């Protein structure tokens, strides 16, 4: 699994943008933790990309308040150590996307039989829909809600200004 | 400080080899933790490069048995997530090397006024001597033991087969 790394410079804007719009809209500006996100979400998760990266660096996967804090501290240090593009790179190569695919390149091959850099806008959006719950939104056997969440990602991209109305209309119909 | 990243492919073999020979000779083969190293060292530290990377990912810097273990668990997971060349890359860009220099490129500029890829064998060895204690072996004000430890690094490189006898003799005299 730990074989399929791809540098950020070879990952299309649509893929990077789809993940940002869906999981952490303020990714490029916060310091590893986002209060405005937590509050507005306290009303929907509030964890940043950095926090997810940190969470997946642990060996055992428990969800106690105790380690949520440890994950937040780790996230802040990482943010102090590596830049945004690097954190995004590590994250996009480690993320479990279902069907035994860890990372965007492996996911691209498993779900579309191609390299991440050959992905279309609608294909990029499908990958960004999986992190929430890979097995729950897996196209290979829950194509109904996979398509629904994909269109929801495209909607988030449209709202954030990452794609045009024209592009949106074409993608949701693919 | 978090501004001066350089990909592994632009870091000279001598630099990578100098760090491996000095800090973790079996780096390329272990799984994040090295028993043979710990035992043989129990007789000299026994922590791997991966463990040092993990140690520096924490925010606060305490040295209790409690977190040494947490660092070992983190190291094992990292090893499962990213490959050797990537772990080496992250490590060589994060390592504090004294005089406010974090990473090999920043160190190269501060100590030699040049890019890491323009470093000679004797210059690479000096950087590998700092991690043990940057302020204790700093050339800028403890050139005596900096030179001593540099020559000790070159000796380790010679022993590991990373440099030739000819190269060794030339470097220790620089
Ligand atoms: C169902 C599914 O899709 N599972 C796969 C999983 O998919 C993960 C998926 O990998 C994981 N994503 C990342 C990036 O880590 C995802 O996280 C979500 C999940 O996170 P999590 O459960 O860790 O709780 C975190 C929460 O702290 C909460 C704690 C607090 C103390 C609150 C904090 C307080 C505040 C005020 C903030 C928080 O504040 O965010 O919920 C968040 C939330 N509610 O806000 C979330 C929506 O923001 C979050 O999404 C992201 N992107 O971070 O959760 C899903 C599944 O959650 C499942 O929820 C079920 C009931 O709700 C539980 O029973 C499950 O145990 C739990 O896993 O990814 C794993 C890597 C897979 O593991 C593999 O499974 C394979 C297989 N069979 O498919 C093989 O067995 C293989 O060997 C094995 O390694 C799993 O099979
Ligand atoms: C003296 C010096 O050079 N200090 C700078 C430091 O330099 C670090 C340096 O950054 C650090 N290297 C890395 C990669 O993290 C270095 O680690 C060594 C050190 O590690 P550590 O103290 O964390 O103990 C780890 C130990 O767990 C031990 C625990 C157990 C429970 C045992 C486990 C049991 C087993 C059976 C294994 C183990 O098993 O390895 O000793 C190891 C050992 N004895 O085996 C070692 C030789 O293997 C190890 O070397 C490496 N490469 O991992 O230690 C030196 C200094 O150690 C100092 O030792 C003194 C007395 O011996 C203590 O009083 C000091 O507190 C301690 O730091 O790096 C920091 C980043 C600098 O911080 C900056 O300072 C600046 C400044 N003023 O210069 C500014 O203030 C700035 O704002 C601030 O951020 C520091 O200024």
């Amino acid at each position: 699994q730990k074989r399929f790394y791809v540098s950020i410079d070879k990952i299309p804007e649509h893929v990077i943008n789809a993940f940002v719009a869906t999981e952490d809209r303020n990714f490029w500006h916060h310091f590893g933790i986002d209060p405005v996100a937590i509050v507005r979400a306290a009303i929907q998760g509030g964890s940043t990309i950095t926090q997810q990266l940190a969470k997946n660096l642990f060996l055992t996967r428990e969800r106690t308040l105790e380690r949520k804090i440890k994950e937040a501290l780790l996230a802040i240090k990482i943010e102090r150590t590596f830049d945004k593009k690097k954190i995004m790179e590590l994250y996009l190569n480690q993320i479990y996307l279902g069907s035994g695919a860890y990372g965007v390149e492996a996911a691209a091959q498993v779900y579309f039989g191609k390299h991440v850099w050959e992905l279309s806008l609608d294909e990029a959006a499908l990958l960004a829909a999986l992190p929430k719950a890979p097995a729950k939104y897996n196209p290979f056997y829950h194509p109904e809600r996979a398509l629904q969440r994909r269109n929801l990602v495209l909607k988030r991209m449209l709202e954030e200004g990452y794609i045009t109305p024209e592009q949106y209309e074409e993608a949701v119909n693919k």
Side-chain angles (χ1 to χ4, degrees), chain A:
Chain A
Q1 72 94 300
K2 180 183 60 180
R3 299 289 289 80
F4 259 161
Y5 194 101
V6 54
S7 58
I8 188 67
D9 43 67
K10 303 189 81 299
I11 297 173
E13 304 285 280
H14 287 327
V15 173
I16 298 173
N17 287 340
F19 276 90
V20 165
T22 309
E23 296 289 335
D24 180 23
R25 69 180 71 175
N26 273 297
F27 175 73
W28 302 99
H29 305 109
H30 60 60
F31 59 105
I33 193 289
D34 183 21
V36 179
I38 307 183
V39 172
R40 183 184 303 298
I43 308 303
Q44 183 66 298
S47 52
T48 63
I49 290 295
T50 315
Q51 279 173 278
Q52 304 181 201
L53 171 52
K55 181 179 69 172
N56 298 137
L57 286 179
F58 284 92
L59 202 49
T60 65
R61 63 291 88 68
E62 61 182 62
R63 301 313 301 152
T64 58
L65 194 179
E66 196 175 308
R67 75 154 36 184
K68 180 55 192 291
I69 290 179
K70 307 188 175 189
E71 298 170 347
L73 302 180
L74 200 59
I76 297 168
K77 185 72 171 68
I78 291 173
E79 285 279 359
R80 299 184 183 185
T81 325
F82 304 106
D83 79 351
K84 291 301 192 179
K85 276 162 69 75
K86 178 56 58 178
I87 299 175
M88 175 59 69
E89 195 188 74
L90 293 178
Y91 172 73
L92 261 24
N93 279 284
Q94 147 261 291
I95 185 69
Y96 182 61
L97 294 161
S99 302
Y102 290 80
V104 290
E105 170 63 3
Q109 283 178 40
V110 178
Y111 294 120
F112 312 110
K114 55 176 64 179
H115 300 295
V116 65
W117 57 80
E118 304 178 308
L119 293 184
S120 58
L121 167 61
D122 62 282
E123 285 163 342
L126 177 59
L127 296 188
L130 309 176
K132 176 186 183 67
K136 178 171 163 59
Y137 295 102
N138 196 300
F140 287 174
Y141 52 84
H142 280 139
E144 297 190 61
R145 45 197 183 190
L147 201 80
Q148 179 169 59
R149 193 162 164 70
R150 179 200 74 185
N151 286 2
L152 168 48
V153 168
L154 290 170
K155 162 68 166 163
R156 286 293 301 129
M157 292 180 75
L158 175 64
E159 296 179 352
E160 291 302 311
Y162 297 131
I163 64 181
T164 64
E166 296 65 57
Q167 300 177 300
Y168 171 76
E169 268 297 302
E170 191 187 307
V172 286
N173 282 290
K174 295 286 186 178

